[PDB]
Design a protein around this ligand. Structure first.
Ligand code: K
Ligand code: K
Ligand code: K
Ligand code: K
Ligand code: K
Ligand code: K
Ligand code: K
Ligand code: K
Ligand code: K
Ligand code: K
Ligand code: K
Ligand code: K
Ligand code: K
Ligand code: K
Ligand code: K
Ligand code: K
Ligand code: K
Ligand code: K
Ligand code: K
Ligand code: K
Ligand code: K
Ligand code: K
Ligand code: MG
Ligand code: MG
Ligand code: MG
Ligand code: MG
Ligand code: MG
Ligand code: MG
Ligand code: MG
Ligand code: MG
Ligand code: MG
Ligand code: MG
Ligand code: MG
Ligand code: MG
Ligand code: MG
Ligand code: MG
Ligand code: MG
Ligand code: MG
Ligand code: MG
Ligand code: MG
Ligand code: MG
Ligand code: MG
Ligand code: MG
Ligand code: MG
Ligand code: MG
Ligand code: MG
Ligand code: MG
Length: 205
RNA sequence: GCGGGGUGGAGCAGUCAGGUAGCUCGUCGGGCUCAUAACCCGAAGGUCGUAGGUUCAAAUCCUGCCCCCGCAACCA
RNA sequence: GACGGUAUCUAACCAGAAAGCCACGGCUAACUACGUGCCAGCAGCCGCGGUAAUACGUAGGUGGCAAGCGUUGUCCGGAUUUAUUGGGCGUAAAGCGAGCGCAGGCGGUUUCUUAAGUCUGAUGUGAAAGCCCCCGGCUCAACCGGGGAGGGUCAUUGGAAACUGGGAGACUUGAGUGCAGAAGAGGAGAGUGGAAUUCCAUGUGUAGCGGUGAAAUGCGUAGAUAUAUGGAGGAACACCAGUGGCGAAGGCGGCUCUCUGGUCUGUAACUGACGCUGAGGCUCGAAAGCGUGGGGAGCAAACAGGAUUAGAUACCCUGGUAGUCCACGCCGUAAACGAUGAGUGCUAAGUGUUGGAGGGUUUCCGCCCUUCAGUGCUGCAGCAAACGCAUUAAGCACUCCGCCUGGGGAGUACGACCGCAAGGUUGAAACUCAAAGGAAUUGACGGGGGCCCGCACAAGCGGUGGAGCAUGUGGUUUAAUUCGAAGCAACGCGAAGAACCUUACCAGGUCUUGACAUCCUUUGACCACUCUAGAGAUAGAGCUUUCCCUUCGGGGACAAAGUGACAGGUGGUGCAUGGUUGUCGUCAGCUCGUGUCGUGAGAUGUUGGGUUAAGUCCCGCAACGAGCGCAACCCUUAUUGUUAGUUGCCAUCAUUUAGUUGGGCACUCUAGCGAGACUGCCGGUGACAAACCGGAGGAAGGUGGGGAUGACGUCAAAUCAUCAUGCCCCUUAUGACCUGGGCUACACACGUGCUACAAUGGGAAGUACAACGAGUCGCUAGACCGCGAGGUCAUGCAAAUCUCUUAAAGCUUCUCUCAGUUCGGAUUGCAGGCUGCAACUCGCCUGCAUGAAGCCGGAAUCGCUAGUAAUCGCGGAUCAGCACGCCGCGGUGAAUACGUUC
RNA sequence: GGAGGUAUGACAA
């Protein structure tokens, strides 16, 4: 049967909102501005390993914390790339945008980054078992208490879609205290979308 | 010409011996069933072939008429 | 010298004239594109082809072979698939139903002899050519030549004597006889005994009896059933009785007698291999059946009637003929079964029991030991596909016999023999299939079993099904009635808001780089607005017409036009998909690692004894651990310490109409931090455990209540219409704009709801107590007008401050008086209120008027186990307006649970 | 614990 979103289950229990601002009359406007900001960043830095976007609002200002495993690539030489990003975002939003980059130590423990890697490899027609196996190995080396991965769709162009998954360690989705990260990524192939799901259980809080 | 029959869709009662239109199957609707059958609950369907008489009253009695069925319509 | 100017040799010239066939899914070496779409077609078998075909056709490649390649035909092989080499017959095909036996096959020990078999030598022959071995010739090879070898169940002849056979003896172990014993439903014949049934006779006696799931038929007042005494006759032999006995098998059970077979144990007197098997034959052979003649109680095909059933030529009931019985004679078949031919020898044990024998005891009885022949059970070695067999082999061996060779057709057809007949014995083919089959494994299932749980049933309360209306659906209708959902798990569902928009549908009016994108574009404003026509989209005029920098060349930001790439599909496929969700179900399960077991699929763990809500825990266990689940961590609710004390609270005080004001936060309250509940403690039960029962304390006790949380998976479940997306289709149209209409239709069927049918009520008046939530052009106070819906002015509040908001049931009085009503409030007329550009299609609401069905609802069916059902309101999401739906809140507040058969 | 006797359900997927 279906399962609650692993993150949504824990938001407000041990995980916090990414959109870290408060507003009453401008709630809808700020929320949609944030969504457009997130979409724009996703398009812009697609090649960079951008995972989490934390948005804070201070009056007309907007502070944006971007976590990435390639801070140099995001920054550019002498901050050229981050500065170009700021100007484009200022045009987009209509207000001062301050950007703060964060280094994602241990990229192997980020659900979105691991899932993105598997999706990229599938697009390149790597064996799905190989992609998932090496992802699990890297995660365990990084020190995840457990990891779980799943790929669904027309695997290897088969006419009947199915789901193939692997896991290692412990991933107790029902234990609320457990710090379990999750992310869903899609790989666009010749036969259509393949869904990639990654659960990463770190040290519980 | 001799008989037998026309009563709900079908098969039948009732008719002699006037008072009250039924039985079996069927049809329609709803149930039961995963579904169908069976089963269960409701409902419809004829003014008794037809026209006249008799009667207080006719599916029932009388007369005619029309349909349907079997038989006969000629023998040395 | 026919061949013949032939072979051959020499010299000149030229890569120039000289490579196809089949195959490429697996078997099988060889792979991709199109086209195709269960069509065309391929194919030796498996099998390919249903819109993404390495299997079809073409193409490009690749593999095999090559002047050949492939197809068909036929033979051998593979085929151990006729097994001499070299198979089998318990359950896969296969042991005749059993025995008696002629011929035949085979045969115990040993002395001598013989030399038929057997072994061996010599000789003769087994032509030549051809295979094979050496050696040669053609340029090689093919081919040719020379010399050898081989090839016989060969003939003659010489040897050997182990084995088989013959001949002459000997032997006693096998076989049989004698002698002494043992048991027995062995057979045949003639008698005979008791219980019971039925019938007959006679008493008593009265209204039933009998029978089924329930009934009926039937018997009975012409006296039944019952009951008592008798009589008749038939069949079978209770207790004993026992994997007990006996028989070759079929089979044989009261008792007695007569006739009669076999078996077993001793003994070692006798014979001295006389034995085993045994085609064909012969004999015997359950039950049913057949002929002749008897007999006939009970039972009982057929048959009759009563039931059951949709039907019931059956199961059930009441009767009942043949038959069952006897004699004689046929028949000759059975799952005639241990589904296992007979004989013989050999290969651990343990333990019953039948019939014996010997011994050591024991006074006897009896106990112990040994031993033979049966008969069971358990179990090594060994065997087996496995199940299993295992001194009573399916083990190890030898002899003889019967029998099997894929399934069906078929034990059929024809023929023959036998039979009175029924039929039996013998026994094919055409044709057709790629399976049939045995054992075991995992699931699923069972009108199998055991143990359990859930508002599953039971116990209860209230409903739906009946009526009106709201609402969804089917059906029908329509220009359209947009699309999706179809048992549980579709149908107050997507839709948390269809007059317009929404809107995807229809009619009509319209447009074509397009309503919306990115890229090139240019002599830059775009818009916006006024007027005109239009239903509007739109068009036709006027109207105004751009920002940002740099050094000034321009550029960048933005329109807008031109232009082509392109856009755009709520077009299709949820049987190509991602994502999301339903569902079993919050049920306790689902699995993995290592190890071990099994030939193997698999198994174990996860099972078992307890225990739990739980695969929860404990214990035991070839299992030891682990993971996803379970539980916990989380939210809310139930008590409370403390920090805080306004916008909240008011006890202490004084004042106000007012918690008002002052004053204080004490209380409540609010919300952070904590405390608290852990079977923690006590008693009893329990395997010293888990745990279970009870107790104390406490606000709360065993998960306190509730929520969130939904394992691996299941239904090609749902969604291409949230979104995204492979492939397919449309592209001046399936795309886009506008007006109107539709989605709201209405002979009918269903689901879900609301309102009722009244007195536990209707109406009137008075009076009291909540909670969750919402609020800026929004909640709206207060006042005034209005019968009312509402309207006017106007106030506070971005809110624990103000408002929505004095909640309704409730309680107290009055009235109605059982009435289709003073119930009911549908439909309808008129008149209004709002919201909105607009209320006809088609909104909600108000007043007056009208006053529908409805008198508690068939078959059937639903929810709920406590602050629950029932009932009463209040808020909110969507939202200009519009809910009987949904989400949430509080008020009042029960009945019942014996119990798990269904 | 074991052993001999006493109503229906096209076809493919
Ligand atoms: K092939
Ligand atoms: K053989
Ligand atoms: K036999
Ligand atoms: K000889
Ligand atoms: K005897
Ligand atoms: K007879
Ligand atoms: K037998
Ligand atoms: K014995
Ligand atoms: K055949
Ligand atoms: K009702
Ligand atoms: K209803
Ligand atoms: K689906
Ligand atoms: K799906
Ligand atoms: K294992
Ligand atoms: K507190
Ligand atoms: K779509
Ligand atoms: K699509
Ligand atoms: K329906
Ligand atoms: K309703
Ligand atoms: K009253
Ligand atoms: K309207
Ligand atoms: K509203
Ligand atoms: Mg190959
Ligand atoms: Mg081909
Ligand atoms: Mg052969
Ligand atoms: Mg068999
Ligand atoms: Mg057999
Ligand atoms: Mg007989
Ligand atoms: Mg009978
Ligand atoms: Mg036979
Ligand atoms: Mg024995
Ligand atoms: Mg009940
Ligand atoms: Mg109703
Ligand atoms: Mg509902
Ligand atoms: Mg519309
Ligand atoms: Mg329109
Ligand atoms: Mg299990
Ligand atoms: Mg567990
Ligand atoms: Mg265990
Ligand atoms: Mg849990
Ligand atoms: Mg489907
Ligand atoms: Mg569908
Ligand atoms: Mg589409
Ligand atoms: Mg509708
Ligand atoms: Mg009444
Ligand atoms: Mg319950
Ligand atoms: Mg309530």
């Amino acid at each position: 049967g279906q399962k609650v979103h692993p993150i949504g289950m824990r938001v407000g229990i041990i995980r916090d909102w990414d959109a870290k601002w408060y507003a009453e009359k401008e709630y809808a406007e700020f929320l949609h501005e944030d969504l457009r900001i997130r979409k724009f960043i996703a398009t812009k830095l697609a090649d960079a390993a951008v995972s989490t976007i934390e948005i804070e609002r201070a009056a007309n200002r907007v502070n944006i914390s971007i976590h990435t495993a390639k801070p140099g690539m995001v920054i550019g030489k002498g901050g050229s790339e981050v500065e170009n990003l700021r100007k484009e975002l200022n045009k987009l939003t209509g207000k001062r945008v301050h950007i703060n980059i964060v280094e994602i130590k241990k990229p192997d423990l980020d659900a979105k980054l691991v899932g993105e890697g598997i999706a990229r490899q599938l697009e390149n027609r790597v064996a799905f078992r190989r992609a998932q196996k090496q992802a699990i190995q890297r995660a365990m080396r990084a020190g995840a208490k457990g990891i779980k991965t799943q790929v669904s769709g027309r695997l290897n162009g088969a006419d009947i879609a199915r789901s193939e998954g692997y896991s290692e360690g412990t991933v107790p989705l029902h234990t609320l205290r457990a710090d379990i990260d999750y992310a869903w990524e899609e790989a666009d192939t010749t036969y259509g979308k393949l869904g990639v799901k990654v659960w990463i259980y770190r040290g519980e809080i």
